[PDB]
């Protein structure tokens, strides 16, 4: 009834939520095979067809089981122009997936980097305090005992400590706003992939029109 | 005129990297710390003294130099004696790290910011705070687990020590013998008998060995060339060796035998030049080194080592348990699942965000569906709402399955879609404690894979993405005024028997036969027909009902079970309950089938527990280490952390250090991958805590790879766009540094821990020509008898490429080579050693005296390259009686690769893919994409090994019209026998590929990728038709011959 079409029948049934008829794997096994009840295999053997084969297919599925080909003239080189469009569009999809991935690693590198900063910071805050225990236990004297041979230099340590602390919190800050442009850049990369995806699928399908009906 | 004068305005080349991965270095932001560097040092006093010190300086060195310069700064007296102090700083993994092993150098600390801090050893159990060892070996801090909330993790960590403790006791049962079994397990083939073609090399089964010895002055060695039976065990070989030492005119025959007996058991056999050891009752030729020696035309070089001087080496492992150190509640605190009366409903609410254009997409929706791997009801999409801009729902999806039907391994799967999928996640409907999930959940979603166009993705990882900055998806699970539990095994068996007895007395009529002691004899053959079918041969629903009906008969053909289990309806509580009971006392089967039942088609705990029991009885430690890759991948498919298969493997890895080794690397290689990160970390943690001293050997390997990862990174990022010559100056300058000299010398090859890697012969180390700057490394073999095996071990470290496809084809190649060999057919493949140890990072065993066909042709360069150059080049190595062999070898190796590359469908074979050893063996390297990933652009497949003129000559000796020779007819017959041999073991390969769907390889994303291997072996056709398929397809590709 050619006037009706396993691996490639699974492939064409992909992206469908439907039925079609197929030849067997052995001649001696059975005749043909039919493929909404969750897509599964219905052997055409069910001495051939009880209704001459096609009369049973039009007829239909709970009636026996408990758990129950467009020609495409719709709209040579029309492969070459659409397939290079598909591949140059595919090239773009996988262009972004690389950028999508690398950015995601990069981002996660930045937040772990920040956790490092924050802890590093805390060890320097904790330090500037550690002297005020042991330094103003020995600010007891203040003005005498060889004047300020001790007390001038103690300040210099304190002075650097705090200005270093600042440079750390400046570097973290810079990182935090670096992560933001990235987070935004990441969301935007995801965005265009989602706009492409269905167009990329249609080009693969609209290729599949003239795919069956040198260059590539 | 060329381009009809058309300008491309978009186009510009200032920075376009198609012309001419991507683990931070020794400090944050910089790969290689400057040779002098400035380190702020914080003390108990608040002074931050900024020392310069050397990149490579120890913490001791900086300590005693911060001891002296602290005298020059204020407030000295209150700073204690330095011996009462330790360093600590924040690392790049962002953790405060006390630095105990102060032999460690500044570069080797992974320091983030160049600063130290002094404190005292808080927590005087300092021996314990060498978890650092483990966290370094694992590649994440152990304390990162302690802070995990989820009690499944905390339970796993504590519960899995059962297996640790047990395995360590089993090591020390017959010690110190059994500790040397653990450490040096004997390396022996699976079949004790040899194949015929190996036997024939021996004259009625006798090998010439050579035992060696050493005695005072101790720098002298002594050959003792025996001629004993291949099948005599090492004891006897030690005996005959001692007979010759002593045999004398002054010993009688009787005195001799007494002097034998005493001297026998005090010695054991070791392979010269590497740390293999013959430690049990095994026929000499069952050991792999011997059967290897036979084949190559070599004379075994063993050694008589004293058991004293072996048991000298093996250290006391002494495992210690960490800080993580029938109902007494009257029956039914909880409600059994089978009591509940309702359909399943689940509340979708809100997706915190989705990244989509408001223009380009029309509308979006949460799609859902309940699963067992494949689906038990219609997918329940939710209505469209706030499409592409602030999307929340608040609906209750109603799933047509009544709650007591839900199978144990049942899972919600979900995604968000467009008028194509946006982001996905799955959830186990049952928690690890058997408890049916209730309340609200916060399911962060995973980005869709690349090629995956399917909306829902139920083969993806179950659980929420541990990156909180993703599409969150809040949802509620119906609550039945009580905590619900999966029914106890008692309860299920009861209900089985009821449905069994309720079967017996049903109507004369039942929709005909439908899904139900008639022992039909045509039917009794239709089972065996279906039994033997290949796993991927999809079954018809008629055949399911057929199989399902004679289920009780199927137990006599135990091998049918995979086909039976698929046919069972899992959304029928009744059907499943009987199946569970069959499986309870079903009889065990071959590990090659049991493996099938640990793929994604089989999620059920009962089914999978059976499979573990088949393996527990019938899988040998040889066949385990053969299929170790697939078993590690299959851990992913498990629902929960603690389970039968992890316990099995962890035990076997702790039994056997050669398993343990690759089991550690295989987990470690995928440690970067956040979907397995936790599961595998926790497993890696348990292994490191139990494995004993090997942890310290693994740390040397791990610490080595880091240096090499870091070196190549610098080479690939800065020293790119500089001539090889400057890069080679840089390479060697870097390797001579003392931190490298420490780190890259004196450790075990991870390609084979048997081999030791001594000192780095830098004269031979070099950066290869490839763009990815692979390092050719070369080490002295520090073995005492290195002379007899190899003076120099050289292996390739490659930072660019994803090795794990190669890894798998090399695996499959071996398994072909072994199937052939044992079946009689001798086709010598060379499955060189390759090991993925990280995200596109690994090791590759070199093969000395082998060159690409292209290189051969440049040695025979004089306009046009002659096809005879190969044949001439091969004759120039092999002359005389030799020559006929070198052809045989080439012919045998060519046939093997012809069949294997055809079947697997690996990347097209040109001259720089294919290599020839001086001895005449041909082998393929760099396989690329296995199952034809290069048909996503662009029936009847391809022959990827196309036998040029060049090859045909060599097969047929120096010849004209070379397709008509008998040499070529014999070559053809090898290919026919080989192609059929593999086909008769096709299940194994179908399963082995299926088990690897869990690894994120773009070539194995679903069962329809593994389609190819069915078509190429042509299993749907008969064998004679497949023969003629192969001949057809081999004729097509060479334009005649076949
Ligand atoms: O689950 C059941 N409960 O009655 C059931 C379903 C179908 C057929 C027989 C029984
Ligand atoms: O370099 C080559 N190796 O096969 C080559 C490439 C193209 C054509 C002929 C030879």
Curated annotation (Swiss-Prot), chain A:
Residues of the full protein shown: 328 to 598 of 724
Domain SH2 span(s) in chain numbering: 4-68
Signal peptide feature range: none
Post-translational modification: Polyubiquitinated in T-cells by CBLB; which does not promote proteasomal degradation but impairs association with CD28 and CD3Z upon T-cell activation. In adipose tissue, polyubiquitinated by the BCR(KBTBD2) E3 ubiquitin ligase complex; recognized by KBTBD2 through the SH2 domains, undergoes 'Lys-48'-linked polyubiquitination leading to its degradation.
Residues that bear Phosphotyrosine: 97, 210
Function: Binds to activated (phosphorylated) protein-Tyr kinases, through its SH2 domain, and acts as an adapter, mediating the association of the p110 catalytic unit to the plasma membrane. Necessary for the insulin-stimulated increase in glucose uptake and glycogen synthesis in insulin-sensitive tissues. Plays an important role in signaling in response to FGFR1, FGFR2, FGFR3, FGFR4, KITLG/SCF, KIT, PDGFRA and PDGFRB. Likewise, plays a role in ITGB2 signaling.
Disease: Agammaglobulinemia 7, autosomal recessive: A primary immunodeficiency characterized by profoundly low or absent serum antibodies and low or absent circulating B-cells due to an early block of B-cell development. Affected individuals develop severe infections in the first years of life. SHORT syndrome: A rare, multisystem disease characterized by short stature, anomalies of the anterior chamber of the eye, characteristic facial features such as triangular facies, lack of facial fat, and hypoplastic nasal alae with overhanging columella, partial lipodystrophy, hernias, hyperextensibility, and delayed dentition. The clinical phenotype can include insulin resistance, nephrocalcinosis, and hearing deficits. Developmental milestones and cognition are normal.
Family: Belongs to the PI3K p85 subunit family.
Tissue: Isoform 2 is expressed in skeletal muscle and brain, and at lower levels in kidney and cardiac muscle. Isoform 2 and isoform 4 are present in skeletal muscle (at protein level).
Protein's recorded name: Phosphatidylinositol 3-kinase regulatory subunit alpha
Subunit annotation: Heterodimer of a regulatory subunit PIK3R1 and a p110 catalytic subunit (PIK3CA, PIK3CB or PIK3CD). Interacts (via SH2 domains) with CCDC88A/GIV (tyrosine-phosphorylated form); the interaction enables recruitment of PIK3R1 to the EGFR receptor, enhancing PI3K activity and cell migration. Interacts (via SH2 domain) with CSF1R (tyrosine phosphorylated). Interacts with PIK3R2; the interaction is dissociated in an insulin-dependent manner.
Entry note about domains: The SH3 domain mediates the binding to CBLB, and to HIV-1 Nef.
Swiss-Prot record, chain B:
Effect of residue 538 to V: In BC; uncertain significance
Effect of residue 541 to K: In MCAP, KERSEB, CRC, BC and HFMH; somatic mutation; shows an increase in lipid kinase activity; oncogenic in vivo; occurs in the interface between the PI3K helical domain and the nSH2 (N-terminal SH2) region of the p85 regulatory subunit and may reduce the inhibitory effect of p85; requires interaction with RAS to induce cellular transformation; enhances invadopodia-mediated extracellular matrix degradation and invasion in breast cancer cells; increased AKT and RPS6 phosphorylation in HFMH patient's cells
Signal peptide coordinates: none
Annotated spans, Activation loop: 924-948
Domain PI3K-ABD, first and last residues per copy: 33-122
Gene Ontology CC: one annotated term: cytosol
Highest taxon of source: Eukaryota
Involved pathway(s): Phospholipid metabolism; phosphatidylinositol phosphate biosynthesis
SMART domains: PI3K_C2, PI3K_p85B, PI3K_rbd, PI3Ka, PI3Kc
Domain (PI3K/PI4K catalytic) ranges: 761-1042
InterPro entries according to UniProt: ARM-type_fold (IPR016024), C2_domain_sf (IPR035892), Kinase-like_dom_sf (IPR011009), PI3/4_kinase_cat_dom (IPR000403), PI3/4_kinase_cat_sf (IPR036940), PI3/4_kinase_CS (IPR018936), PI3K-type_C2_dom (IPR002420), PI3K_ABD (IPR003113)
Gene Ontology annotations of biological process type: actin cytoskeleton organization; adipose tissue development; angiogenesis; anoikis; autosome genomic imprinting; cardiac muscle cell contraction; cardiac muscle contraction; cell migration
Record-annotated C2 PI3K-type domain positions: 340-487
Residues annotated as domain PIK helical: 517-690
Record note on what altering residue 453 to Q does: In CRC; likely involved in disease pathogenesis; shows an increase in lipid kinase activity; may disrupt the interaction of the C2 PI3K-type domain with the iSH2 region of the p85 regulatory subunit
Impact reported for residue 55 to H: In CRC; likely involved in disease pathogenesis; shows an increase in lipid kinase activity; may disrupt the interaction between the PI3K-ABD domain and the N-terminal lobe of PI3K/PI4K kinase domain possibly affecting the conformation of the kinase domain
Molecular function terms, GO-annotated: 1-phosphatidylinositol-3-kinase activity; 1-phosphatidylinositol-4,5-bisphosphate 3-kinase activity; 1-phosphatidylinositol-4-phosphate 3-kinase activity; ATP binding; insulin receptor substrate binding; protein kinase activator activity; protein serine kinase activity; protein serine/threonine kinase activity
PROSITE patterns assigned to the protein according to its UniProt record, in alphabetical order: C2_PI3K, PI3_4_KINASE_1, PI3_4_KINASE_2, PI3_4_KINASE_3, PI3K_ABD, PI3K_RBD, PIK_HELICAL
Impact upon substituting residue 998 to R: Found in an endometrial carcinoma sample; uncertain significance
Family, per entry: Belongs to the PI3/PI4-kinase family.
Note: The avian sarcoma virus 16 genome encodes an oncogene derived from PIK3CA.
Protein name per UniProt: Phosphatidylinositol 4,5-bisphosphate 3-kinase catalytic subunit alpha isoform
Species the sequence originates in: Homo sapiens
Gene: PIK3CA
